[PDB]
């Protein structure tokens, strides 16, 4: 569907740019993501390293662990955009480490586990925020 495909594109495009160094609502989301997601990574490098270790991703397809933790994160019934942006930013940190340990790692299985957790498990919440527009407005700075 639209929300799944739109989200997958946004999250993959961010994850691929991050790993390599390379609709309209989607362009906005992508811009916001670069600014906020980069904010998250810088200043939380040491925490992110620590989590990556404890997760112990063996390869590009070793996502089952990442899925379970992400599900766990949301199991308190709290939903907000700071958390969502954090999940995606960690996603990009993991993508960068994947390419440094195998230069033709596909970022796709990872973007997919993130998109799945987000869109299947927070579908109606996202729809109610008007999707990626809620994200863009939340992180909107003047």
């Amino acid at each position: 569907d639209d929300l799944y495909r739109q989200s997958l594109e946004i999250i993959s495009r961010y994850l691929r740019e991050q790993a390599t160094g390379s609709g309209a609502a989607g362009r906005r989301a992508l811009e916001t993501l670069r600014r906020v997601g980069d904010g998250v990574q810088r200043n939380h490098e040491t925490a992110f390293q620590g989590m990556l270790r404890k997760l112990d991703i063996k390869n590009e397809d070793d996502v089952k662990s990442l899925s379970r933790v992400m599900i766990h994160v949301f199991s308190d019934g709290v939903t907000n955009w700071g958390r969502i942006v954090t999940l995606i930013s960690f996603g990009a940190f993991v993508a960068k480490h994947l390419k440094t340990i195998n230069q033709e790692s596909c970022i796709e299985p990872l973007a997919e586990s993130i998109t799945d957790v987000l869109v299947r498990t927070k579908r109606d919440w996202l729809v109610k925020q008007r999707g990626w527009d809620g994200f863009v407005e939340f992180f909107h700075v003047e």
Binding site: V36, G39, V40, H44, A47, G50, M51, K54, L55, R68, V69, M70, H72, V73, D76, V78, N80, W81, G82, R83, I84, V85, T86, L87, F90, F138, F139
Partner: peptide, 23 residues
């Protein structure tokens, strides 16, 4: 449990970003 620690780290950082842009 490694998973509890990872989850908590995610929420700590996530909620901090939430609070910052909420205010």
């Amino acid at each position: 449990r490694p998973e509890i620690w990872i989850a908590q780290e995610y929420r700590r950082i996530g909620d901090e970003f939430n609070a910052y842009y909420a205010r």
